[PDB]
């Protein structure tokens, strides 16, 4: 909380990089070394339209945020707070410059992602979540919009505005965040005050939801009405589309089902998730010993794979323009091109909020008289 003169004579602002609800991010340089950085200027007065209780609570919130982010600093995959400057009207928070935007624009441009980058991002997120849980700190705000990408595909968590310390033996009873990412425990806290509380399970549910939306391309739960969406979430009857996931492995789908569990106790932890065979890999080892049955099994598996590879290659179908006449959605290239073209035509009506979402573009429902039955 040094004087503003130090910031004025040490950092020189530059052009705007982005805008927010009440803050804008600008580029700055460090005069001694000419190192680029990003500074977040927060107007605690809110342009003078804030009653002083609002100013006081915003100042308390930002002080809590800075002193909770002070401890976490050190992890390579987390945002680094380089300098802090405080005035009676403005806060200057200096972080690392990333380069590009966060996950929303990337996913919108690429429509859907493959498993190769998915494995890496999920591994990094699980490591970060495990480290955060080890430090007895919770976040409750995993959204794709709070994860930034570097030029080398590096992710680090940011926007900890809702993070708070959790004393052991305590059970929080507060409700916050986007309803689509709300775990059933939080909503149960909403209706009923007798429920004890929640914990890291909401974090696992959020991880499952973001994994689902990056894989399928649409959120697992979404509807035009909030009440029906909440009932949809409470029911916990997420379904798999038929002509959408016919080219994905069984292990990934099993992991999908394992992440999303209604019972809080049965939900998998970060350590348990990291031990799944999906992340299994080998470098080198020479202590493989077993019975002759093991040798026969391994040789049979090798022969079976060698035989099956050719048959799997042979299972390709031609273009079948007649099938295109009947149904073009069956073919994967036709589906991907139709999807990408629909996205580029209608690409500037996908933004923040429940009013507009990616799920509003796809219509897998058979639009007919069955739309009459909606709810009670």
């Amino acid at each position: 909380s040094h004087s503003a003169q130090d910031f004025y004579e040490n950092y020189e602002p530059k052009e705007i990089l982005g805008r927010g609800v009440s803050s804008v991010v600008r580029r700055c340089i460090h005069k001694p070394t000419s190192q680029e950085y990003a500074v977040k200027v927060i107007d605690v007065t809110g342009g003078g339209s804030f009653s002083p209780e609002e100013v006081r609570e915003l100042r308390e919130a930002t002080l809590k945020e800075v002193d909770i982010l002070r401890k976490v600093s050190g992890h390579p995959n987390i945002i680094q707070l380089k300098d802090t400057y405080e005035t009676n009207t403005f806060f200057f928070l200096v972080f690392d410059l990333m380069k590009r935007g966060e996950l929303f624009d990337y996913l919108t441009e690429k429509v859907t992602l493959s498993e190769k980058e998915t494995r890496k991002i999920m591994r990094a997120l699980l490591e970060v979540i495990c480290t955060l849980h080890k430090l007895n700190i919770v976040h409750r705000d995993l959204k794709p919009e709070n994860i930034l990408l570097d030029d080398n595909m590096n992710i680090k968590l940011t926007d900890f505005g809702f993070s708070c310390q959790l004393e052991p033996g305590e059970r929080l009873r507060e409700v916050c965040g986007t309803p689509s990412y709300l775990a059933p425990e939080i909503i149960e806290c909403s209706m009923n005050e007798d429920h004890p509380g929640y914990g890291k399970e909401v974090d696992m549910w959020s991880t499952g939801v973001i994994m689902y939306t990056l894989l399928a391309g649409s959120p697992p739960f979404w509807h035009r009405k909030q009440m029906l969406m909440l009932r949809m979430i409470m029911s916990g009857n997420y379904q798999f589309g038929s002509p959408e996931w016919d080219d994905y492995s069984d292990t990934v789908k099993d992991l999908v089902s394992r992440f999303l569990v209604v019972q809080p106790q049965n939900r998998y932890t970060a350590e348990e998730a990291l031990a799944h065979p999906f992340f299994q890999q080998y470098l080198v080892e020479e202590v493989r010993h077993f019975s002759p049955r093991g040798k026969f099994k391994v040789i049979a598996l090798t022969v079976l794979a060698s035989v099956r590879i050719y048959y799997q290659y042979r299972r390709v179908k031609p273009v079948t323009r007649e099938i295109v006449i009947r149904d073009p959605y069956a073919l994967r290239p036709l589906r991907r091109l139709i999807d990408a073209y629909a996205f580029r035509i209608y690409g500037h009506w996908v933004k923040k909020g429940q009013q507009q979402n990616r799920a509003a573009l796809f219509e897998n429902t058979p639009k007919a008289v069955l739309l009459s039955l909606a709810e009670e």
Binding site: A4, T45, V319, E363, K367, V369
Partner: protein
């Protein structure tokens, strides 16, 4: 900078601007970009070309004739002759700053193309012409056939430039002697500047109010040596520079001032003068009555001064606080004004450092200009009804009627002692109108007085400079206009008045929306993508429709609500609809068709498809495929023709579905490798897709009510409500219909592979 003009992709004459003569360029990255572009596009064998497709001195064209016929399909391609002048520019450009190896390379290259005449002295030929017989080979092998000298060649320009370059390279002269003004250091960055702002109080009450909240200011008095006046008197003063009676010279004509000129102090007859900025003038327009915009233009103007400030000394801004800046009860300033004051306190406001104080301290450190050229060498019944009646509405109606009928300048004789003219009463009504904050007749009276916004031509030329076409007026043709070139202020005002006709308020609304776009594109020039042509009238009707839908009222009520909104409301709604943020899908399709937001690479795909077909017929009108060879996708005329062909249909939903169908044709054409050799009817494809959708829905078992028919379409509304993608989207139906139509005109074999 990257393009010479809106018609030429590049002109090699841009080198002179960015070389030895008249250095005017910043952000050197653009300099290297344009140098690399000109090198990779205009370099030849024995010279460089002025620009693509110039026919000067060619074995075709019938040089005896001028006024080129529009038949430059291939008669002026890859046969632009040469121009070594741009080559001899390169040697000087290289040798000037720090480059030597490039100088040697260019000298070696140019020495080979030299010709020796009498006495064995260097001579620079003008250009080398392609032989008239070896023309077909060049079309297949560009820059391969040798050329021959032809034309005038005592070219003194290039010869003198080369002589100066050689003399410079020999080292007899230094680069610092050619330009004593040191114009070589235009690329040196400047860190920043500090802005000084002084605050003054108009009266004692305002001073007391500011002192109550802890702000120490000083009134207009007590600074008797220093006087403050508006900027229009300063313009009238500057309108006398360089005036001569014997030679019939009238001096500098009247013009508006920027804030860059009023900031600096002035000296007039051993006296100090300070001039307030021009945007606090309430006698010109009413946008200065809103505190939010006052704050916004303060922010943008402080940013503008802090950006360049290419003058010596710190700036100085005077911001007097006016009576209109108080609240309703007149005992305290508005919250926004107090917030702005606290904000430029502590030395950070907007995007600049602001330091406050008193004019006494700023006097010793501030730029001062010494000025020397100002040194001495029954209508009576109607009038009675107006006098007796009340209400601002009838007031405006009767004043307008009297002005239009008999009172452009006639005295009303309302007051027996003072001659009260209609104009005097109208301008007096402003005082009463401003207090009530009623945006219901202020625009009405402003239309009667025909007030004009300053710097409108600047906004128009800024709009035009972005490769943009303007259009004033509601549809349809021919009253709709097209401003493709900048026009004078009087011509612009006459044109907008003619377009707006007698609706009067339309001219004011057009001016306001133009000004809104004007300050908007500079800050965020990113939302104007996906757009090629804007119409003020279409935007106005879209605004009225959106407000009517929001309020669920009639058109008249929507217009009344729109005309009553504060200007901040118009800015907010314009930004909202520019961002883009049954009944849901159909509304958005209608908005898109109204704003005809065609994709970024639409014209390129249309051109590629036209390359492999005879044309695209749209309800009789046909676009022949011969257009593809007389024109290139980069230029404007193809976009104009494509939009005109697509704009024949009036219904926005039709144009959007046509865009979707032609785009699905574009994607489907890539898979097959064949030539259709026939004309394609997009409407037939749309009807086939609609029929397939209806048949599928009937097969499912839907009742007849949902398969409704629009009164004048033949297209189900559920198709409009349907999303594009998905297993039940309109894209699948359009693709199926397009494939069926392609098969209908195909020799019994598709042979599609990808």
């Amino acid at each position: 900078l990257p393009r010479a003009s809106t018609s030429k992709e590049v002109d090699a004459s841009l080198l002179s601007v960015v070389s030895f003569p008249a250095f005017a360029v910043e952000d050197s990255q653009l300099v290297e970009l344009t140098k690399q572009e000109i090198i990779t596009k205009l370099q030849g064998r024995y010279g460089c070309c002025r620009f693509l497709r110039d026919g000067y001195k060619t074995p075709k064209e019938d040089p005896n004739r001028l006024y080129y016929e529009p038949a430059e399909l291939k008669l002026f391609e890859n046969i632009e002759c040469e121009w070594p002048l741009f080559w001899t520019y390169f040697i000087l450009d290289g040798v000037f700053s720090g480059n030597a190896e490039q100088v040697q390379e260019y000298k070696e290259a140019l020495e080979a193309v030299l010709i020796k005449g009498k006495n064995g002295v260097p001579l620079l030929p003008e250009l080398y012409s392609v032989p008239p017989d070896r023309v077909d080979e060049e079309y297949q092998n560009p820059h391969t056939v040798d050329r021959v000298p032809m034309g005038k060649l005592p070219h003194m320009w290039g010869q003198s430039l080369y002589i100066l370059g050689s003399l410079m390279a020999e080292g007899f002269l230094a680069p610092g002697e050619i330009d004593p003004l040191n114009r070589r250091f235009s690329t040196v960055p400047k860190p920043d500047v500090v802005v000084q702002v002084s605050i003054l109080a108009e009266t004692e009450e305002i001073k007391t109010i500011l002192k109550d909240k802890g702000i120490y200011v000083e009134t207009i008095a007590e600074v008797y040596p220093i006087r403050v006046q508006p900027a229009r008197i300063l313009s009238h003063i500057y309108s006398s520079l360089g005036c001569n009676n014997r030679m019939k010279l009238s001096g500098r004509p009247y013009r508006h001032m920027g804030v860059l000129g009023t900031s600096k102090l002035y000296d007039i007859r051993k006296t100090i003068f300070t001039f307030t900025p021009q945007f606090i003038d309430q006698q010109q327009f009413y946008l200065a009555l809103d505190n939010k915009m006052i704050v916004e233009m303060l922010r943008t103007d402080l940013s503008y001064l802090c950006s360049r400030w290419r003058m010596t000394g710190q700036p100085t801004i005077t911001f007097p606080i006016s009576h209109s800046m108080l609240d309703e009860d007149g005992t305290s300033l508005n919250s926004s004004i107090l917030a702005a004051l606290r904000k430029m306190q502590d030395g950070y406001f907007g995007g600049a450092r602001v330091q406050t104080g008193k004019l006494s301290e700023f006097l010793t450190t501030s730029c001062c200009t010494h000025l020397s050229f100002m040194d001495p060498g029954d209508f009576k019944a109607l009038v009675l009804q107006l006098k007796e009646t009340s209400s601002l509405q009838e007031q405006a109606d009767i004043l307008y009627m009297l002005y239009t009928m008999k009172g452009p300048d006639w005295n009303t004789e309302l007051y027996n002692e003072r001659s009260a003219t209609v104009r005097e009463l109208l301008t007096e009504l402003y005082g009463k109108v401003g207090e009530i904050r009623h945006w219901g007749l202020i625009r009405y009276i402003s239309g009667i007085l025909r007030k004009k916004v300053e710097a409108l031509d600047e906004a128009c030329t800024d709009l035009l400079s972005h490769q943009k076409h303007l259009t004033v007026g509601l549809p349809p043709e021919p009253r709709e206009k097209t401003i493709s070139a900048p026009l004078p202020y009087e011509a612009l005002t006459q044109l907008i008045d003619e377009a707006s006709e007698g609706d009067m308020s339309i001219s004011i609304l057009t001016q306001e929306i133009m000004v809104y776009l004007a300050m908007y594109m500079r800050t965020q020039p990113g939302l104007f993508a996906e757009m090629f042509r804007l119409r003020i009238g279409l935007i106005i009707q879209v605004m009225a429709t959106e407000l009517a839908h929001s309020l669920r009222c009639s058109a008249e009520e929507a217009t009344e609500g729109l005309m009553n909104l504060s200007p901040s409301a118009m800015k907010n709604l314009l930004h909202h609809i520019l961002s883009g943020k049954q009944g849901q899908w159909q509304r958005r399709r209608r908005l898109d068709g109204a704003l005809n937001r065609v994709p970024v690479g639409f014209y390129q795909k249309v051109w590629k498809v036209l390359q492999k077909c005879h044309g695209l017929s749209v309800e009789g009108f046909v676009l022949p495929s011969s257009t593809t060879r007389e024109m290139t996708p980069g230029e404007i005329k193809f976009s104009v023709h494509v939009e005109s062909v697509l704009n024949r249909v009036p219904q926005p939903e039709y144009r959007q579905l046509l865009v979707e169908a032609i785009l699905v044709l574009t994607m489907l054409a890539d898979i097959e490798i064949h030539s259709i050799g026939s004309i394609i009817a997009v409407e037939k494809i749309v009807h086939i897709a609609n029929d397939l959708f209806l048949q599928e829905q009937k097969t499912l078992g839907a009742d007849d009510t949902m398969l409704a028919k629009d009164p004048a379409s033949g297209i189900c509304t559920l198709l409009y409500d349907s999303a594009p993608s998905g297993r039940f989207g309109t894209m699948t139906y359009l693709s199926k219909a397009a494939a069926t139509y392609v098969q209908e005109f195909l020799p019994h074999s598709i042979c599609a592979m990808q």
